[PDB]
Design a protein around this ligand. Structure first.
Ligand SMILES: [Mg+2]
Lengths: 93, 93
DNA sequence: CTGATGAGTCAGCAC
DNA sequence: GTGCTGACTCATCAG
């Protein structure tokens, strides 16, 4: 067990490992402490959520880039399959 | 004691001059709470607009890769026009 | 001050 | 219990 645990601790340990440093604490101290855990936990979930949110937009911007890369040479490749196909028709005379 | 009680919608939509009339009578402390509640309410909106703007800009990114996946297609098919213009006019030179 | 936005808290849903 | 995310509050910054 030990004494009072810090944030970087309560949130890291397992659920049973908590019932351990939990022995001997009024009915309220029992919940209120598991609460401070959940709260600390949510705080972290929020942090992933913020990141995720960004890294997902990152991906669209990345695809977007590339899926414009192709439709750039596909507009120029087809511009060339018309410039030389036009000289294979004028040669016809 | 004293005070006349408004509603969120009212207080937020209310205008600066209306607000100032609704102030007459209100104890100083009462003014403070009121002005703060208004701000909190205002932030609520800013936050809402903010959430929106995120959605807005996210669809917009897709509804743009939606114009690049459908544009790499109107050009992948204009790429089918080459089979006829490089096989039917290139067996003549 | 007004508007915007990261961080954190909270409820509510999903597994 | 765990993880996630919408809505909200708060601090804090540009304009
Ligand atoms: Mg709250």
């Amino acid at each position: 067990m030990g004494t009072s645990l810090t944030d970087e601790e309560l949130v890291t340990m397992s659920v049973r490992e908590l019932n351990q440093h939990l022995r001997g604490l009024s009915k309220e101290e029992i919940i209120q402490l598991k609460q401070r855990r959940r709260t600390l936990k949510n705080r972290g979930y929020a942090a992933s959520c913020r990141v995720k949110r960004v890294t997902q937009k990152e991906e669209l911007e990345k695809q977007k880039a590339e899926l414009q890369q192709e439709v750039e040479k596909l507009a120029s490749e087809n511009a060339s399959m018309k410039l030389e196909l036009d000289a294979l028709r004028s040669k016809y005379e």
